[PDB]
Amino acid sequence: NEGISTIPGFNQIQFEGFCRFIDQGLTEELYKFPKIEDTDQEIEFQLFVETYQLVEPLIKERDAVYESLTYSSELYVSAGLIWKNSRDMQEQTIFIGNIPLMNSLGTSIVNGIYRIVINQILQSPGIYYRSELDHNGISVYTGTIISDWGGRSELEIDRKARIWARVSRKQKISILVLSSAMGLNLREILENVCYPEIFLSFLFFQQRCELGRIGRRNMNRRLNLDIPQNNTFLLPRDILAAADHLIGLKFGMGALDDMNHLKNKRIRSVADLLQDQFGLALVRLENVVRGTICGAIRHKLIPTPQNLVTSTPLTTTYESFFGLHPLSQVLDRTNPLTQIVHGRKLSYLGPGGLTGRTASFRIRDIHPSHYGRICPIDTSEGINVGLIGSLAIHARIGHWGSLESPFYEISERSTGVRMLYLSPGRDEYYMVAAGNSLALNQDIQEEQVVPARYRQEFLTIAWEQVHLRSIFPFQYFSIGASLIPFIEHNDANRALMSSNMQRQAVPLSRSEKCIVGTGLERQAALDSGALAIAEREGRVVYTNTDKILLAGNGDILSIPLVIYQRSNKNTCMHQKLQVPRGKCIKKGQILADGAATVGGELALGKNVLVAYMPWEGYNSEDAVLISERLVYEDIYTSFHIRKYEIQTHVTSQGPEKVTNEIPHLEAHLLRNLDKNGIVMLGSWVETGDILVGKLTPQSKETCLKLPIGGRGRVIDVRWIQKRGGSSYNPETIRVYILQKREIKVGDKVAGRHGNKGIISKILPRQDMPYLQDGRSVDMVFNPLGVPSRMNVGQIFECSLGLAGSLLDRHYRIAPFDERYEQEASRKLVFSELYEASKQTANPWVFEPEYPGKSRIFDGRTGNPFEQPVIIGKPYILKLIHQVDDKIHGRSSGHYALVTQQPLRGRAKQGGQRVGEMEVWALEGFGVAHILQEMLTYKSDHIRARQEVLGTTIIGGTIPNPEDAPESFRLLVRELRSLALELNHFLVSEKNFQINRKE
Amino acid sequence: CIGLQIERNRGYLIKTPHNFQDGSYPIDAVFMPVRNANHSIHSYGNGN
Amino acid sequence: RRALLGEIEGTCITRVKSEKVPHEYSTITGIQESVHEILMNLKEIILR
Amino acid sequence: GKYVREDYLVKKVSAKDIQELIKGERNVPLIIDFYATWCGPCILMAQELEMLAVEYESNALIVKVDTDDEYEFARDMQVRGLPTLYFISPDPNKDAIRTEGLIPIQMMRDIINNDL
Amino acid sequence: GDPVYPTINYIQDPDEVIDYRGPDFHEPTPNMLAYLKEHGKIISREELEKILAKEKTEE
DNA sequence: TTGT
DNA sequence: ACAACTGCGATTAC
RNA sequence: GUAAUCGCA
Ligand SMILES: [Zn+2]
Fold this sequence. Notes:
Chain A is 24% helix and 22% strand. Chain A has 24 helices and 53 strands. Chain A has a nine-stranded mixed β-sheet with strand order 37-51-45-46-39-47-38-50-49. In chain A, a hairpin with a 2-residue loop joins strand 28 and strand 29. By secondary structure, chain D is an alpha/beta fold. Helix content of chain D is 35%, strand content 20%. Chain D contains four helices and five strands. A five-stranded mixed β-sheet of chain D has the order 1-3-2-4-5, sandwiched between helices. In chain D, strand 4 (84-88) and strand 5 form a beta hairpin. Chain D is globular and about 40 Å long. By secondary structure, chain E is mainly α. Chain E has helices at residues 32-38, 45-58, and strands at residues 11-12, 42-43. At the A-E interface, helix 1, strand 2, strand 3, strand 4 and helix 15 of A face strand 1, helix 1, strand 2 and helix 2 of E. Strand 48 (810-812) of chain A pairs antiparallel with strand 1 of chain E. Zinc ion binds next to loops of chain A. Zinc ion (ZN) is lined by residues 486, 488-489, 817-818, 825 of chain A. Chain A binds three DNA and RNA strands through residues 113, 323-326, 329-330, 332, 354-355, 357-360, 363, 380-383, 500, 503-504, 568-570, 880-881, 885-886, 896-898, 904-907, 912-913, 915-917. Chain B: It comes from Nicotiana tabacum (Common tobacco).
């Protein structure tokens, strides 16, 4: 009913999954709970499943995220306990536990953390019929039956009939024996099966037969069976049929099954995981009920139903699931695009799925079945390549667990038009043509030829024979790839790089829309969740920075805005009002604009003038030369907020005490602290200052200091008293600093077309090359990247952007504009440039001799360059990786307790690692002393290291260490714990004496 | 009520004293009055 | 060209003192703009 | 409709409903809109009617009639084409105003304010 | 020459606020809590309180 | 898994 | 039974 | 101090 005439919601998948869960999965799980009766009198407690009612959360989301509490709902079910002596059943409602609730965006709040549930792709239960060719002889044919639990009832055939099951570890097993054990009398078996001559010539249980509803259906499909859907059990007729098909495969009457086909796979959504978690929680609850009944019998007391049930199992189960499950990950909130793209991921790796190493090559390639249902250019780069992928824009999840795609039906009928979400297996038996119909050759139009898809193949057929047509432009891609303008002119390899780099953008202090776009930024910003959308019609009577008042139908609703908040990836979140006071807004329109969004469209970068030429080497490899205008005009300024927290953990000996007056500290510090041991709001701090001062008696000084690189204003501090832990808990003090970061040498910039670079010099505007207009270019890029990485759409974008800037237009172009004609992008770009040149009379914009190229001058000398250069205004983004974060340096500070090597990590102030591939290079160069120094006194030799500082301060020569490092000594100790000795035992060549080194 | 300090300099100024007397915030300033400039050299056609 | 761009000097606001604001990344009641927006607006004040 | 607000505020009335509304007494101006799912221009007209209904919460009544369901009634109302709007005044002596084609929202506001 | 596909389709006003109630956008997203409450999936605290009070009074 |  | 790139950095969970 | 997960080149 929805998504067949417009782009569906990006978060509709999680929405419908959570809805189906709450609708049916809770009741289905509550139905299967057993009747607790563990006694001689058989005192029985029961839960009335019909009286299942969830309750609204006691706290709001804005309070859960603030107080680090979970956002859940209360499950109340009426229960009846029939006592043995009372001979009656008292009925009361019990609080089983809390069930987490999902937001409209798909995210859940557990312990104050935003977490998303990534979907998993698992093979569907069924019969599979693979084959394998033997080294010598005929090819072996095998049929595997897959169960919901994961049972494998294999069947094999040798050169003879030899219908042997591979269930047993032994050589083989008799299929006739299995059929006789099933119930067959050895006569009806041969009577029912086809080709009975072959069968007659040849002369644990619950989990294998636990076929799902899906399993039943599939079994019926492959092996024609009329077994009702309800009977989801491995019937012997199914086995008989399986055998029949297997023998038939030997004579050529069969078709093997492709296990990479989607129709053979199921998708597990948040509902499937929540249902299993609820079942496990119910099992734990039944165990706890049995235990408390056993205890009440020991204490000679018949208790009320409330006394039996405790709220622990449900809460602890859901908490452990959200905390430790491999398919529950924290939401990435670097930019609004990440929030939406995170919930569309489909993963092969997971609990019950292929591990990175396990996955065969075949698993990781596109299968023709993935067309329109999965993204063919969005994967995870690394060892898990081809195992983590996204979900198509127009896809939906089906009733049977299969992803479905929208296909138009061009076949003539009563309606003559349909949009059907065909499942993966069904679209194979259809002629799907993605081409247009704008061709006439003096014959009827239906006689024209067009490429089409049939039986997982490509072929050319007449328009009379095509049943389906793929009209939607964004049907075969995902949100990440669809945001790439002119994607047809870019290589498929660079598309993945561009999709990955769009995810890294940092929201800037100011936002500007893109001149050239694909038109998906609107719905992206709509479904991102960082936008204020009204839920009621009315008028905006009052406008304020903190809140917005919307008066409608005699009711006033207040919407709270976000003012300089902090995301999970240290990126600022802020919202600004868009609508003025006194205008009407419908239910759905935009009230305010969040970060990285202006005018309701996603805006992850800026539009700057760009020239493609080499400049004095500053552009070698990939490197960008940028002007100072981007610096002193705050074009790429961004705000980053980092949090630091230390809990006041109360030890058994003494609790921690927070005092401002702490001795043994210099007077230059502690200025920011208040009367209480905490920094004040609005205080500028730097590296090595004290944020929270604690006496820590148990006295000492476990304080909070700033690390290297932390220089920002203290925006807010929170004193968080922790409760609900069944006992007094430590208070938490969270400080927040805001670091304004400008664009600097070493920062990464990127373009939507896969172009990435690192700034190398900030030249002034006077030295920058200027156009014939007189304006200096903002950035200069290397023109040799285009033939290397094969990105041609960037040129188009630059030019169209120049044209737009001059004519004050914004172009939202759907991909694959060459379906209309040939060189449609080129025609559009050249036409818009000419118009700009005519309207604003700048002849330079369109040069008839070389369209799209102009001749610029040098800022230094003032002489024109020989060849023309490309001048445009592309959309450049600033990436999260920044130099400040990557800078690091260690002299001699801290060591590991056991290894005694220097520590790891930039935050921990640790050195760099000399691996085996570097020791090899050092040995090849022949630098023995450098290797020895690095392996002993710069790393592990405690005495030598202690002496190094003294020798360097005094200035004396550092002697060569002769003792063994701590790593070797450790080995000796370990090996001798393993009862193995190790002695150096050096022998002097002078006097032939053995000397042990300890 | 707000106070302002006006200074005359050249080029762009980096707000170096972020840590300074409380209640006063330093703003980076660009002292470039000329926004853009351009020149063109056309011939006079005077023969030799 | 090199003289007009970089060798001409001007005057601009360099320091702003606010009365009772905690920090420059907060909002004051009665004003639609934050302290940072007010600083950015004062940054573009042309003087002679 | 207490928890979730309705997305669309204009209701599809039948011909008998319009006859009863015209026959009865009204205290607010009435606006009748004939539409058809098929006409392209009507997609825009509906958006402007939604905006007008939001701007006039309870000071005017806005209803829509589908020409496909009531073709004879629309023909009897002398409706030439689809983007047609009927402006019924509250006082029953004044004359109704019929507008055809896409008209600006300000024109509708001025008509409702002055003509009706 | 002029492109076959009209350029006016791609042209968009720079300072334009996108109306999410247009023909190319989907229906507004309903809040999960309100959507579950309106259909009766999740009851309010008042209903549970009244049910518990009635059960206590009956006992 | 894949092969040793 | 055994092994299947090298390192780095970030987060949360124990 | 160890895991899980993602990213980086
Ligand atoms: Zn193109």
